[PDB]
Structures are given as structure tokens and as C-alpha cells.
Amino acid sequence: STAGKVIKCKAAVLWEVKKPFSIEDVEVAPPKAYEVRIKMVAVGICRTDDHVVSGNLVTPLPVILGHEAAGIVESVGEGVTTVKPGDKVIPLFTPQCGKCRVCKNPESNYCLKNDLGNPRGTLQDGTRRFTCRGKPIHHFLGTSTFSQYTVVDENAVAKIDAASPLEKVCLIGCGFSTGYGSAVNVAKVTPGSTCAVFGLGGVGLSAVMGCKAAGAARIIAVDINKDKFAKAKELGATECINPQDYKKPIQEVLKEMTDGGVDFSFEVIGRLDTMMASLLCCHEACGTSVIVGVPPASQNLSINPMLLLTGRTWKGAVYGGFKSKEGIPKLVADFMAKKFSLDALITHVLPFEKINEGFDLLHSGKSIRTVLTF
Amino acid sequence: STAGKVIKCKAAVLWEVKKPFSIEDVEVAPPKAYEVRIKMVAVGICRTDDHVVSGNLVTPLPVILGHEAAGIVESVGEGVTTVKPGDKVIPLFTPQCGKCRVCKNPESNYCLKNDLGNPRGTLQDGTRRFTCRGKPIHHFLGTSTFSQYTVVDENAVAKIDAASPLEKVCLIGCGFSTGYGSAVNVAKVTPGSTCAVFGLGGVGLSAVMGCKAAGAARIIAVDINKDKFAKAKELGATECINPQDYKKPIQEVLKEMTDGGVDFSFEVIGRLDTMMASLLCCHEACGTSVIVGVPPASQNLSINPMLLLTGRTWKGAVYGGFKSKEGIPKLVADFMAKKFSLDALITHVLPFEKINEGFDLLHSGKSIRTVLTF
Ligand SMILES: NC(=O)c1ccc[n+]([C@@H]2O[C@H](COP(=O)([O-])OP(=O)(O)OC[C@H]3O[C@@H](n4cnc5c(N)ncnc54)[C@H](O)[C@@H]3O)[C@@H](O)[C@H]2O)c1
Ligand SMILES: NC(=O)c1ccc[n+]([C@@H]2O[C@H](COP(=O)([O-])OP(=O)(O)OC[C@H]3O[C@@H](n4cnc5c(N)ncnc54)[C@H](O)[C@@H]3O)[C@@H](O)[C@H]2O)c1
Ligand SMILES: [Zn+2]
Ligand SMILES: [Zn+2]
Ligand SMILES: [Zn+2]
Numbered sequence: 001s002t003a004g005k006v007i008k009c010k011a012a013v014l015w016e017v018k019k020p021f022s023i024e025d026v027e028v029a030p031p032k033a034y035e036v037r038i039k040m041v042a043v044g045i046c047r048t049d050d051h052v053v054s055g056n057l058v059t060p061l062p063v064i065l066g067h068e069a070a071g072i073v074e075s076v077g078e079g080v081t082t083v084k085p086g087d088k089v090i091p092l093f094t095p096q097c098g099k100c101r102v103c104k105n106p107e108s109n110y111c112l113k114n115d116l117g118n119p120r121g122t123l124q125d126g127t128r129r130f131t132c133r134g135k136p137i138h139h140f141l142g143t144s145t146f147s148q149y150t151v152v153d154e155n156a157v158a159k160i161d162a163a164s165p166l167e168k169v170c171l172i173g174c175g176f177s178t179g180y181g182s183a184v185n186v187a188k189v190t191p192g193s194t195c196a197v198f199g200l201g202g203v204g205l206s207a208v209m210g211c212k213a214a215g216a217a218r219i220i221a222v223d224i225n226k227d228k229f230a231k232a233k234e235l236g237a238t239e240c241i242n243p244q245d246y247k248k249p250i251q252e253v254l255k256e257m258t259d260g261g262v263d264f265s266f267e268v269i270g271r272l273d274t275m276m277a278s279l280l281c282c283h284e285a286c287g288t289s290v291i292v293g294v295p296p297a298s299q300n301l302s303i304n305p306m307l308l309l310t311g312r313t314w315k316g317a318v319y320g321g322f323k324s325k326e327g328i329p330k331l332v333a334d335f336m337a338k339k340f341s342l343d344a345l346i347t348h349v350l351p352f353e354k355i356n357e358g359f360d361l362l363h364s365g366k367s368i369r370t371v372l373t374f
Numbered sequence: 375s376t377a378g379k380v381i382k383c384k385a386a387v388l389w390e391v392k393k394p395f396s397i398e399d400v401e402v403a404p405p406k407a408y409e410v411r412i413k414m415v416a417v418g419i420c421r422t423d424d425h426v427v428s429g430n431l432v433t434p435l436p437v438i439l440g441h442e443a444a445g446i447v448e449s450v451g452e453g454v455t456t457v458k459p460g461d462k463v464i465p466l467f468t469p470q471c472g473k474c475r476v477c478k479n480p481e482s483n484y485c486l487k488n489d490l491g492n493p494r495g496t497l498q499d500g501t502r503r504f505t506c507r508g509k510p511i512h513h514f515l516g517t518s519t520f521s522q523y524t525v526v527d528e529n530a531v532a533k534i535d536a537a538s539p540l541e542k543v544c545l546i547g548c549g550f551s552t553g554y555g556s557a558v559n560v561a562k563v564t565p566g567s568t569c570a571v572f573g574l575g576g577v578g579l580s581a582v583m584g585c586k587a588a589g590a591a592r593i594i595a596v597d598i599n600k601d602k603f604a605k606a607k608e609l610g611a612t613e614c615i616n617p618q619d620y621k622k623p624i625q626e627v628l629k630e631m632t633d634g635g636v637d638f639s640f641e642v643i644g645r646l647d648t649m650m651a652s653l654l655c656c657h658e659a660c661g662t663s664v665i666v667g668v669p670p671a672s673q674n675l676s677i678n679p680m681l682l683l684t685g686r687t688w689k690g691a692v693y694g695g696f697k698s699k700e701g702i703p704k705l706v707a708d709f710m711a712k713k714f715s716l717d718a719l720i721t722h723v724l725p726f727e728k729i730n731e732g733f734d735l736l737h738s739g740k741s742i743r744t745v746l747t748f
């Protein structure tokens with residue numbers, strides 16, 4: 001039995017920046033009140049995990065990363081009512097406490113219970129459930145899914161269809177939802193509109209899917225890696241261009257391709273140069289630009305306010321505007337009904353033990369999404 | 375008669391920056407096809423005209439400024455069909471050609487025929503109708519209203535109720551429409567929301583009026599000049615604050631007064647610091663900040679994209695988002711129908727020949743709007 005007891009299992013621990021993960025033997029404390037301990041089944045490799053490794057995203061170390069996943073509830077702490085042992089679930093990197101100003105506001109989703117703005121690397125009560133070799137290990141985004149077992153706050157856990165193919169839907173835990181929603185919830189792409197998507201990783205490609213579903217007439221995919229183009233077109237890109245092929249700035253090229261600029265531009269990479277280009281490429285009077293990629297720590301853009309005064313709308317969001325706990329299940333039901341597929345996004349499958357190899361592929365540009373199995 | 379002939383009249387010419395205006399005899403050529411010659415009756419003094427004087431906004435010189443006004447049609451060139459001699463009309467600093475991409479888009483108003491983005495100081499055909507001392511004189515925003523007679527493009531002239539009090543309705547040509555519309559069309563203030571308004575000039579007080587109309591439960595007026603607070607309250611502000619009274623940055627004060635920041639913030643001054651503070655005071659997850667004020671030439675804001683990634687919406691606009699030709703007449707009709715008064719905004723009245731005195735008043739801070747009568 002394991003309920004009420006400390007769990008000993010394997011987890012991928014990051015001891016320091018710019019080093020490989022080390023698969024360690026770790027101890028996982030039982031769930032406290034309003035906490036859920038989950039046996040992990042599958043985890044997707046997202047660039048945000050990698051940002052911590054590269055030092056581009058700050059969070060307290062040592063730590064167990066991982067936030068895009070699906071598992072089975074092993075046990076629940078006292079007070080828990082939304083999930084029970086055996087349920088299939090998806091941890092949410094941005095919770096939905098349902099009690100703060102944001103959660104009450106129908107237009108926002110950045111729950112105040114988050115651990116993104118100023119990471120503590122703990123659960124909501126401010127403590128850690130992880131220990132390894134006599135040392136406490138930090139949580140990441142309240143989820144830490146690069147571990148056979150993890151403890152997450154209830155409001156950061158969603159119950160999903162029991163028949164769910166956990167090795168597929170784990171992408172709904174982050175990449176798909178974020179990309180797709182940035183188009184449908186955040187930007188609010190209108191039918192017959194023109195869009196531009198910067199970055200064709202699992203998130204950017206989902207953004208491409210979102211634009212198509214919203215009914216865009218033109219979806220121009222932009223990426224410096226041409227091997228991402230077939231998938232982009234497969235998912236709805238009407239055009240694919242590579243900035244490296246041109247002599248003039250990419251924003252000028254884009255504007256000249258769309259009568260002054262696209263209606264909706266999305267930055268889905270995490271760089272300042274492309275965030276700028278993306279803003280500059282949407283029409284100065286009727287364009288909307290959405291920041292989706294996480295920028296490098298404290299890096300600042302330099303913009304002339306005039307760019308906005310003409311009529312531009314510049315926004316950003318996490319999770320594609322989806323209120324995590326309510327949105328994830330609906331999205332899974334949609335997947336189950338075949339409204340959309342994630343096959344094209346899953347390029348590689350590897351056992352959790354080969355996690356480092358999973359990151360190598362991300363670094364190589366050969367993978368879109370590598371799903372790890374436990 | 376003057377029809378078909380060159381008009382000799384008085385006009386306020388600016389031959390160089392940071393110098394007073396020069397009331398001189400100027401010649402006004404007859405209107406070309408699709409152009410409208412107007413006998414000016416009243417013009418409000420807007421900070422945008424002053425920007426040119428101070429060097430803060432560049433436009434070719436010599437020039438005749440003036441863009442917030444109301445007059446009577448003297449004559450129309452061939453092809454003109456929307457106005458006739460004797461009609462009361464309001465010139466528009468942003469046109470509504472009705473045929474370009476922007477005009478066709480229901481949600482945009484920055485017509486491509488504008489002369490703001492990259493000033494030529496001419497009418498839409500690239501030439502000028504003014505001459506003075508044997509030399510041509512430039513137009514400003516296609517209106518040039520600091521003149522007894524001015525010629526404007528038809529799509530930049532709106533016909534209004536024949537019983538309209540021109541000495542009041544003139545404000546509807548810029549400041550009132552911009553400020554009010556910024557709240558009602560650009561920000562789309564929701565009932566029961568919280569707002570912050572930086573700048574309590576004629577445009578800012580109009581923003582306050584806009585927020586009240588939209589049903590804001592809370593409207594915080596921000597200004598370093600406490601003499602504006604009486605009018606702010608009179609116009610709808612629930613509280614007024616002067617940054618000079620605090621040790622902490624204003625955005626921090628604003629956030630702490632409003633549970634993490636207001637739902638809507640407006641910058642109606644034209645400064646980087648206030649523009650930054652304004653963006654920072656809207657709630658990180660559900661706030662919207664709108665740029666109304668025009669920033670000094672080529673100055674840039676340094677911004678961390680993370681301010682947007684949490685959920686903030688940053689936007690700007692001209693004319694309060696109103697499609698000028700359709701919008702202005704309806705606002706005049708609302709005024710006629712007593713829906714809103716403009717008396718609180720007009721604090722001084724002077725004849726056109728004392729234009730320099732009205733600007734002195736603007737600089738001194740003793741006036742909201744000074745109206746010049748011809
Ligand atoms: N807002 C959110 O909630 C949220 C959620 C998930 C991920 N993200 C962020 O999304 C971003 C992308 O995520 P991913 O997992 O899909 O990343 P990814 O690395 O798999 O793919 C990004 C793409 O950008 C392309 N690219 C890189 N540099 C380029 C450049 N200079 N110009 C043009 N293209 C270039 C790459 O070739 C790659 O195809 C990351 O920054 C991640 O942090 C945000
Ligand atoms: N977007 C547009 O279409 C549009 C239209 C009209 C005017 N504008 C611009 O809007 C802005 C305001 O116009 P106005 O005519 O009402 O100007 P104004 O000079 O009369 O009013 C500015 C107000 O802001 C206050 N203020 C100045 N500096 C401040 C500071 N550092 N901190 C706090 N408060 C400060 C001033 O005391 C004054 O009360 C200007 O930039 C003008 O060019 C834009
Ligand atoms: Zn992610
Ligand atoms: Zn919440
Ligand atoms: Zn137009």
C-alpha cells in the first residue's frame with residue numbers, strides 16, 4: 001500500500017543550470033489536506049522546462065521540472081473532493097483556485113495561486129514534498145511532472161475522461177491548449193482574417209491549428225527551420241517563410257505580403273527580436289499581436305508608443321487564456337470526440353529514463369513534441 | 375463673392391518652433407474637386423497643436439496649425455456631394471475615406487489618407503492651398519483651422535445639425551471625442567469596473583466622462599496639478615490623487631488602492647513615465663491600458679514583455695476609435711439631445727487674434743479648453 005506513506009521512486013532532478021538531468025532516487029511525502037498525489041503516466045517535453053536549464057527562466061534549484069503531463073491519482077489528502085484515487089488527471093501549471101479576483105473575472109485565468117511570476121518552488125502552503133539524498137527538492141509551477149510520483153494542489157489538478165489515452169492528452173496539459181487558445185481565446189481570430197505565427201514548435205503549431213479553427217483566410221508560418229514547414233502546412237498554414245531567405249527585416253516582408261500587415265500576429269518562441277518583429281508585422285491600425293513565448297529573464301524590449309497609438313492591440317497570456325481546471329476537461333472531451341488530433345505534434349516517444357535524449361531532440365530541432373513514458 | 379476665387383484673410387502662421395504664432399494676411403486658394411472651403415467660427419486649443427510649437431511633434435514648417443474646430447461651408451469644389459455652402463461642419467484630423475482597408479474594417483478608424491503618421495503638411499493630393507508673403511504654407515493634419523478660411527478634403531469634413539452651437543460643439547472635433555471614445559470604444563470600460571485616468575486636461579476629463587458613462591464603479595483621477603480635481607470629481611471621478619504627495623511610485627499606490635491594480639488605465643498626457651506607470655497600474659491578469667497621449671518624437675519605452683504575458687492588454691488609438699465622418703455627427707446629435715454637456719470643459723473664450731494668449735493659458739495650467747472665436 002502507499003496511501004499515508006512516504007513514496008520512494010525515481011525522478012529527473014536538475015541540480016544546477018546548464019547540466020543534464022540526473023535520474024535520482026527520491027522520496028515523495030504523502031499529500032496534505034487539499035493536495036493530490038499522482039502516479040505519472042506520460043509527460044511532454046516543453047521549451048519552458050528547457051528555459052530553466054538554460055538559465056533563461058529563473059526558479060529555485062535544485063528542482064524537479066515538468067508541467068505538461070497526465071497520470072492516475074494515487075491518493076488524496078483530507079478535504080479533497082474533486083478527484084479520488086484511480087481518476088485520470090492532468091496537472092495544471094497555472095491553477096484555478098476559483099476564489100481570487102482573477103478566477104472570478106470571466107476574462108482572466110492567471111490565478112493568484114500561481115508560482116510563475118515570482119517562483120517559490122513550493123506547493124501553495126509554501127513547503128516542499130520532495131527530498132533527494134538528504135536534501136529538499138523544489139517543485140516547478142506547482143506540478144513537477146518529471147517524476148514517477150508528484151504531489152499537487154487540488155486546484156491545480158483536473159479530472160479527465162477515464163478512457164483518455166494518457167500518452168496523447170498530456171499535450172493538452174500545456175502546449176496544445178496554450179497555442180490553440182492564444183488564437184481562439186486571447187487574440188480572438190476572426191473568420192477571413194490574416195494571421196502570422198512566429199515559431200513552429202508544439203506551441204506555435206497549436207497556434208496554427210487555432211487560427212484555422214477560428215476560420216482565418218491566411219496563416220503565414222514563420223520559422224528559421226524549414227523542416228517544420230510540412231507539419232505547419234499540414235495543420236493549416238497557407239504559407240511558410242524563413243527569415244534567413246530574405247535581405248530585408250521579416251516584419252517588412254510580412255507587411256508587404258498582406259496589404260500593410262496581418263490582422264493577428266503571434267510570437268511563439270521566446271525572443272525579443274521576434275517579439276518585436278511580430279508586433280511590427282500586424283497592421284498599425286487594425287492589428288493584434290499576442291506574446292505567447294516566455295522571454296529571457298528580465299530582458300527588455302524598446303518600443304516607440306507610436307506603434308500602438310495608431311490602433312494596435314498588444315496582449316499576452318498563459319495557457320491560451322483558458323481557466324485551467326474548467327478548460328482542460330472540455331478540451332479532452334473535444335479530443336475524445338475527434339474534434340482535433342495531436343498525432344502530428346507527437347514526433348518522438350521515449351521512456352522517462354531517456355529524458356536527456358528527449359531534450360537533445362528539442363535542441364536539435366528534429367522533434368516537435370517528445371512524450372515520455374513511465 | 376469669393377466662390378471660385380482666392381480668399382485673402384487672417385491666419386495664425388508658425389514660421390519656426392518655440393516662437394509665438396503670427397497673425398498674418400494669407401491667401402486661400404479655391405477648393406479643388408472633392409475639397410471644401412470653410413469659414414471658421416470656433417476652434418479649441420488642443421495640446422497637439424502645442425506639441426508642434428514645442429518641437430515635441432514634427433510636421434513641415436511654415437504651417438497653419440489648428441484641428442479642433444467648427445465652421446460653415448463657404449464653397450465646395452466639383453464632385454463634392456456631402457456638404458453644401460452654408461452647412462455647419464466639423465473638420466476631422468483623421469479622415470474617413472471610406473474605401474481603404476482601415477475604413478472597411480468595423481473596428482478601426484486610422485484611415486490611410488491621414489497625415490499624422492508621416493506628415494506631408496498638405497491635403498490628400500499632395501499640394502497646399504495656402505500662401506503668405508509670396509511663399510506656400512503647410513497644412514496640419516489636413517485641417518489647418520487657425521485661419522479665418524481653410525480648405526479641407528471632403529472625407530475629412532463632417533456635416534452637423536444646423537442648430538449646433540459652434541462655440542461649444544467644436545470640442546467634439548478632437549478632445550471630447552478622443553477622451554470619451556477612448557473609454558467607450560477603445561478600452562470598452564465595463565460596468566462596475568475600476569479605472570485610472572492620468573491627465574485631467576480637456577482630453578483627460580473627457581476620458582473620466584467616458585468611464586462614468588460606461589458605468590465604472592471607480593474612477594481615479596491622477597494629476598500633479600491639484601486645481602483640476604474639482605472638475606474631475608464634477609465629471610465623474612470617485613477619487614483624485616497627485617503623485618507628488620507620495621514617496622512610493624504611483625503605480626504601486628494605484629495597485630494598493632485597487633486590489634492589485636485597476637481594470638482600465640488611460641494615459642492622457644504624452645509622457646513616457648506616465649505611460650509606463652499607466653501600464654503598470656492595470657491588474658497584471660485582467661487589466662487594459664490605453665495610450666491616448668502623444669509621446670515626444672522618437673522616444674522609446676523600455677518594457678519587460680512579462681508585463682503582458684500575465685494577461686495585460688496594451689492598446690492605443692486616435693480619435694477615441696470613432697470612424698470620424700460617421701462618428702462626429704452622432705456625437706453632436708447626442709449633445710443636441712442634452713445627453714452630455716461640454717460647459718465644464720470650456721473655461722476660457724477669446725477672439726482668434728489673441729491666440730497666443732490662449733496658449734499662454736494652456737502652459738500656465740489655468741485652462742482646460744480655451745475656445746477661439748472668429
Ligand atoms: N504562455 C504560455 O502559457 C506558454 C505555455 C507554454 C509555452 N510557452 C512558451 O512558448 C515558447 C515556445 O514553446 P515550444 O515548446 O513550442 O518551443 P520550441 O523550441 O519547441 O519551438 C520554437 C520554434 O521557434 C523557432 N525559432 C527559434 N529561434 C527562431 C528565430 N530566431 N526566428 C524564427 N524562428 C525561430 C524554432 O525553430 C522552433 O521551431 C517557449 O518560449 C515557451 O516558454 C508559453
Ligand atoms: N490620440 C488622440 O487622437 C489625441 C487627441 C487629442 C489629444 N491627444 C493627446 O492627449 C494628451 C492630452 O491632451 P490635452 O489637450 O487634454 O492636454 P493638457 O496639457 O491640457 O492636459 C495634460 C494634463 O496632464 C497633467 N499632467 C502633465 N504632466 C503630468 C505628469 N508628469 N504627471 C501627472 N499629470 C501630469 C497636466 O497637469 C494637465 O492637467 C496630449 O498628448 C495630446 O497631444 C491625443
Ligand atoms: Zn509548457
Ligand atoms: Zn484563483
Ligand atoms: Zn480610409
Ligand SMILES: [Zn+2]
Binds near residue numbers: 421422442548
Ligand atoms: Zn487634438
